[PDB]
Structure formats: structure tokens, C-alpha cells
Amino acid sequence: GPGSMCMAKVVLTKADGGRVEIGDVLEVRAEGGAVRVTTLFDEEHAFPGLAIGRVDLRSGVISLIEEQNR
Amino acid sequence: GPGSMCMAKVVLTKADGGRVEIGDVLEVRAEGGAVRVTTLFDEEHAFPGLAIGRVDLRSGVISLIEEQNR
Numbered sequence: 001g002p003g004s005m006c007m008a009k010v011v012l013t014k015a016d017g018g019r020v021e022i023g024d025v026l027e028v029r030a031e032g033g034a035v036r037v038t039t040l041f042d043e044e045h046a047f048p049g050l051a052i053g054r055v056d057l058r059s060g061v062i063s064l065i066e067e068q069n070r
Numbered sequence: 071g072p073g074s075m076c077m078a079k080v081v082l083t084k085a086d087g088g089r090v091e092i093g094d095v096l097e098v099r100a101e102g103g104a105v106r107v108t109t110l111f112d113e114e115h116a117f118p119g120l121a122i123g124r125v126d127l128r129s130g131v132i133s134l135i136e137e138q139n140r
Contacts, residue, residue, distance in 0.1 A: 006076040052122035069139040
């Protein structure tokens with residue numbers, strides 16, 4: 001199989017108050033105005049006005065929050 | 071049954087310019103003015119004026135950056 005590795009899921013909330021979730025994530029990045037997310041299958045996603053809030057390596061979860069410096 | 075667990079490292083830099091690294095990280099949390107870091111062995115570290123910059127599950131690496139929202 002693939003051997004030793006780690007992977008996770010991202011969860012976030014829209015300006016509408018709607019929840020959104022992304023599986024099979026290999027990396028997450030906070031830019032100077034947005035959060036970026038990239039999967040095992042090379043799909044990239046990007047969300048303006050977010051920041052990275054919490055990370056958990058036991059559960060395999062990342063939670064994003066709405067940034068307040070903007 | 072196989073082990074489902076993962077852990078990371080955290081990397082950051084002090085206001086004195088001193089480089090800092092933390093191993094065996096279980097979870098990380100950005101509060102409204104500080105980052106907190108908790109280990110697999112129930113130790114804890116805390117750092118005011120940081121935010122989470124990157125989370126790289128492929129490598130097991132978390133990177134912190136200086137908060138601009140002060």
C-alpha cells in the first residue's frame with residue numbers, strides 16, 4: 001500500500017453561516033487575505049477572509065475561522 | 071489492529087529572534103491573541119502574538135507566523 005503517511009479533513013463556515021467540509025487534505029496555507037486547501041487527488045480550494053483556527057493530529061481535523069483584521 | 075494515530079512538529083520564532091521547535095504535537099489552537107500547543111504526553115506550550123501560517127499533513131509540520139491584528 002501507500003506506506004507511512006498522514007492526511008486530514010478541513011471544516012469551515014461561509015459568510016452565509018453555512019458549514020463546508022473538505023476530505024483527504026494533505027496541506028493547508030494561510031495567505032495574506034485567504035486560506036488555501038489541497039487534496040491527495042491534487043484538487044485545490046481557496047476561501048477569502050478566513051484564518052486557520054485549530055489543528056488535531058489524533059482526529060485528523062483542521063478548523064478554519066473568519067479573520068477580523070480585514 | 072493497526073495504529074490510526076498521527077503527530078506533528080511545530081516551528082516558530084521569538085520576539086528576541088530565537089528559533090523554537092516542538093516535537094510530538096497532538097493538537098494546536100489559535101486563540102484571539104496567542105497560539106497554544108499540546109503534546110502526545112500531556113505537556114503544553116503557549117505563545118502570545120502568533121497565528122497558524124501552514125499545516126502540512128504530508129510532512130507532519132505546522133508553522134507559526136507573527137500576528138498583524140494587534
